[PDB]
């Protein structure tokens, strides 16, 4: 029961890093590990300050990955408390950055001490890949670094991502993988054309209203043992000039898919091209994909999370692909197995972001069970 | 073949009366009636000037009714020709209200004074009812006039709006009537949510498409031997925030029906309600209802109109309720029996507005066909 976890984060949140301000925090990180065996190289692009802080040259290579940045709090007097100067309230610790993600950071830190105290000569090496934006466009940050990574060959075994995974007690969910991400701008053609005569326009609402039906109600695929089903959702329509005696001449559609490993962006592309095409839609179709899914399968990573949960937590760890996406997504390409372990995800990006602070030492102490069983 | 429709058509193209100027068009028509006979009742409803002219105190009462607005021409330097400078070219007449409605203004007052001067004894009455304002808002317009008119009793038999009617050739299509409209602005309620978290939303998009293309794919009605099917047709569409990876909280659609007498007001809404609820849509509606079909079935009136198309033109005419509406929608509430008949409305409020030169007197020859057939 150690107090340290809980004093770093406060200071993490005391600092106002919104994106993509550091604030300091990777300055702050580096200064402390260096007493215990961490070199620092500061790897900054544009306005994004990035770090890579490691411990020893050899596998295996544990690396905990992390921002120091934080959304924006929007209009301070709607919280109860000021969003950067944490205040401890009835079991919670508040704070912008409480749950996403300072808190992790700070309990990997003081992890890493108790390990390294306890365990001076352990094989392998643990480093800390750290950026001041994730939350924003991302451009500069993590990315950036693992190009870095890569083209020297400087490789991870075993990498965890602090993120809030937590549905609710710490533990009862890691993320192993996150579905891909394929958008779709769709422009459907009729003919513009005075409401009176119907028959001398193409009403582009009434030509994809079949086409609009099949694909939302279309199920893409099974999902699997790691993945659910794949999802289809419409984000925005939008149609017409606004005059109530007017037939459009076009309707704008704009539409995603979070994918799993079941279907292919090609596969899908291709069913949605399908379906306009036997309704017999005349359209324009853009499409853009931020990214595939990606997955660590239940190996030596997912076993040791589960693990090191078990003995702090006394509860069993689901394994969980859902949600949105992290930096996981750039590091997994560097990194033979990948997992997000945080706490709850409950109050991220929301007014009053708070974390339990019980949970603040059990974190830490996890984060310390996985190194033991690594190195 | 007179030559005085052309010339009074002219006169009044170079008005600029852009609703709801008159311009003056009314003083020039009843100081010019008032040498045959025709009494002058001006009726001043704030910025719109009408008046009713009358020759004739007894039935059958007969009236010609027409605006003498007409709608703005956009930028001048786009017409080949000044708007409002008529000009005779490639057999036609060009300028802003040579086909809506001026030159059948015109063709009646010039079809009124070769009648009176053949016929000095005629039976009942002939009446002009003019409005400055029947292609704007028309609050103070027509509506006013039938107003005051009913309101002492003073009915009419026959009245013929000098709208543009015809497809092509003059007199190859006759108005008998014109459908309703009834209009709904539709709030489909959902969930707002993050698109990667389906589950705690709820698409309006989604829940909307089975009632959507249920409403889309309905047969309202079968038309019957004056109107065509009642019509529905979507002109806007609206949802989302803008964010391609949000799901909207609401949908909004606005709809109209231009319906013919197979169909009631209260029958089309309780159908689209109950499309909407049997697919579990949620959602507000709002109903507007701008008129009720109107409808002059085969009697004396079409049998006259076709009659002296038939000698003046050699066609055999069609009676239609397509298209728009007109001030008929007014004036049927007073007249036993009410038809349109006017030139090609193909170029109605568009530039190069224009009608066929032969067509005037032809249109006014028409016009005094029906006066002798009638008194």
Redesign the interface.
Known sequence: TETQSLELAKELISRPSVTPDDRDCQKLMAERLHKIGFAAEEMHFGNTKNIWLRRGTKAPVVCFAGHTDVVPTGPVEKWDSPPFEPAERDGRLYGRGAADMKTSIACFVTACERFVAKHPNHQGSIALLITSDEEGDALDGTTKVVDVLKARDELIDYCIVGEPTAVDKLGDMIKNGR?GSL?GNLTVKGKQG?????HLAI?P??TF??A??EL??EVWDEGNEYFPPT?F????????????????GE?NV?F?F?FSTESTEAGLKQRVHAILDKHGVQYDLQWSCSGQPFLTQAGKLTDVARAAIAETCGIEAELST???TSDGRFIKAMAQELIELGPSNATIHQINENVRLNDIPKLSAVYEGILVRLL
Do not use: F
């Open positions: 579905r958008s005075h409401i009176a005569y119907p009403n609402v009434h209203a079949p609009l039906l939302t109600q999802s959702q419409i984000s925005n329509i939008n149609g017409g000039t606004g005059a109530t005696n007017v037939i459009p309707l704009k995603n979070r859902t949600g949105g």
